[PDB]
Amino acid sequence: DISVAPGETARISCGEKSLGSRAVQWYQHRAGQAPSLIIYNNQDRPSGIPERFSGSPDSPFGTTATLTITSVEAGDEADYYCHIWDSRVPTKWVFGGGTTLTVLGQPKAAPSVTLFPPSSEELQANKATLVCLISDFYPGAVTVAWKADSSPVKAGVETTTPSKQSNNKYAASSYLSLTPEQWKSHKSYSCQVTHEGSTVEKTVAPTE
Amino acid sequence: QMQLQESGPGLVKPSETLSLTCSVSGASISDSYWSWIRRSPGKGLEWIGYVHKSGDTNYSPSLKSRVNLSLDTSKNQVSLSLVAATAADSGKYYCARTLHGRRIYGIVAFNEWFTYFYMDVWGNGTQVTVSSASTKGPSVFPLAPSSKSTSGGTAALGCLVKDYFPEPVTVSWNSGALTSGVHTFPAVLQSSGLYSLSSVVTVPSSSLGTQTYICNVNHKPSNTKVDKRVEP
Ligand SMILES: *[C@@H]1O[C@H](CO[C@@H]2O[C@@H](C)[C@@H](O)[C@@H](O)[C@@H]2O)[C@@H](O[C@@H]2O[C@H](CO)[C@@H](O[C@@H]3O[C@H](CO[C@H]4O[C@H](CO)[C@@H](O)[C@H](O)[C@@H]4O)[C@@H](O)[C@H](O[C@H]4O[C@H](CO)[C@@H](O)[C@H](O)[C@@H]4O[C@@H]4O[C@H](CO)[C@@H](O[C@@H]5O[C@H](CO[C@]6(C(=O)O)C[C@H](O)[C@@H](NC(C)=O)[C@H]([C@H](O)[C@H](O)CO)O6)[C@H](O)[C@H](O)[C@H]5O)[C@H](O)[C@H]4NC(C)=O)[C@@H]3O)[C@H](O)[C@H]2NC(C)=O)[C@H](O)[C@H]1NC(C)=O
């Protein structure tokens, strides 16, 4: 999983080192789109595929298949899969890679975090959900840890994967499901969102 | 040109048979090999198998016991059958024309070649969820007003739309009369098999006094319409 700025060159390794001889296919999977063949027979670009997309050559043995994208544009942000066929290695039924190329087509944006405590209504219903709402961050990769008081909480945590909001920034949700007991007992609960090294952490308390 | 369209029961109860259909238009299935590929939410692209009129047909060893690819020349369709489905069989399933090539790296004589396959044309894929989940309408909870996270003079309030199934839920606010500042987050698929989403709207803090905020959660799958008054 790698990020590059537009114009930068993306080199993507995938699969084991070559054993025998190979025909490596590359496929590009843009978010929501159908995948597309972008390289077959190690280096051959299908009709349509821009010269920016080069594949790695078959030999020497022990080579790692490598997709090179030069002069990267936004349209290149996708998952990239190699499908390796090696003469001395059985046919891969699972495409290697899934290496997510992120094209940083805009500057890093800090995540806005909103944290809602359990509603009374929810507690009345003998349930408790902490809602962490994360928005307007870029790139679209956050990490969300919950803390009861200051101890990390394993269970109850369901976090969405990020998703582009309309302003091309990303949004995410994390829910912490609790029993009303769990909630009423700890002095606080914290939604800690880590994005791009920095961390925002909201806290709520049953006393509200 | 060639276009592919996977279709089939988007939802399948565990142990039931996942059957998908790739409808090919503007090309004969008989002119190509055909693969099914799934992207399992877990790990990326699993080539499910391929099938030709030839009878040159093979299945992912992990699926060989359960899967049946199949061509219907008259219906012009590739078909996938995955019996005894489980949650692991959830994913987006792509149909793809599979082309092939010889990689000739030594001499044919010494058998120093092999046939490789590759998919030039993919269908959009059809999402398939294998879930024990039955249609469940949402508990809708008010997310009472909170200024901590918003800009000055404003506060966020929301509706937590909890434990519904299947997708989707629609949330509007004050019957669409409030669109400004509304952020309906995409749902989360929980361990429960159930979805929850939240929709927050950011409003004038001044207005909490007077403006009534009702989120109108609509979850047609269960014919449930909830209109939560969200009070401070
Ligand atoms: C496989 O997947 C592919 C690709 O999937 C896509 O890509 C993925 C990654 C993801 O993004 C998916 O969402 C994508 O779908 C898929 O193929 C796609 O299919 C999509 C829809 O199925 C298409 O979506 C369209 O995209 C265009 C933009 O396209 C550009 O970018 C595309 C994607 O980014 C790209 O593909 C293209 O290359 C291109 O560069 C978008 O603009 C379209 O949006 C319109 O349509 C949707 C509904 O279809 C609608 O929700 C939108 O609001 C919008 O509707 C139009 O809205 C405008 C502005 O509001 C209206 O303009 C006004 O029109 C009025 C007319 O008034 C009416 C009236 O009410 O009175 C309308 C009446 O019904 C009508 N009455 C009659 C009898 O006709 C009349 C009449 O028109 C006139 O009055 C007669 O005089 O009036 C006035 O003209 C106003 O002045 C005017 O402002 C429009 O009218 C309104 N029109 C429509 C049609 O509703 C849309 O989203 C993708 O492009 C497409 N991609 C490709 C490559 O094909 C594919 O399906 C999958 N394969 C299969 C088959 O499985």
Author numbering:
A (entry chain A): 9, 11 to 67, 67A, 67B, 67C, 68 to 95, 95A, 95B, ...
B (entry chain B): 1 to 82, 82A, 82B, 82C, 83 to 100, 100A, 100B, 100C, ...
Quote what the paper states about this structure:
At an IC50<50 µg/mL, this family of bnAbs neutralizes 65–70% of HIV-1 isolates and also recognizes an N332-sensitive epitope. One of the main characteristics of the paratope is a 24-residue HCDR3 that forms an extended anti-parallel β-hairpin with either a type-1 β-turn at its tip for PGT121 and PGT123 or a distorted 310-helix at its tip for PGT122.
On the other hand, PGT121 interaction with a complex biantennary glycan could be observed on the glycan array and in the crystal structure. Alanine-mutagenesis experiments in the PGT121 paratope were performed to show that the residues that contact the complex glycan in the crystal structure are indeed responsible for binding complex sugars on the glycan array. These data indicate that PGT121 LysH53, which mediates two H-bonds to a galactose moiety of the biantennary complex glycan in the PGT121 crystal structure, confers complex glycan reactivity. Indeed, mutating this residue to an alanine completely abrogates binding to a complex glycan. This notion is consistent with the PGT121 interaction with the complex glycan in the crystal, as it has significant interactions with the core mannose residues that are a common feature of all N-linked glycans. Modeling of the “PGT121-liganded” crystal structure in our EM density reveals that the complex glycan is adjacent to the N332 glycan.
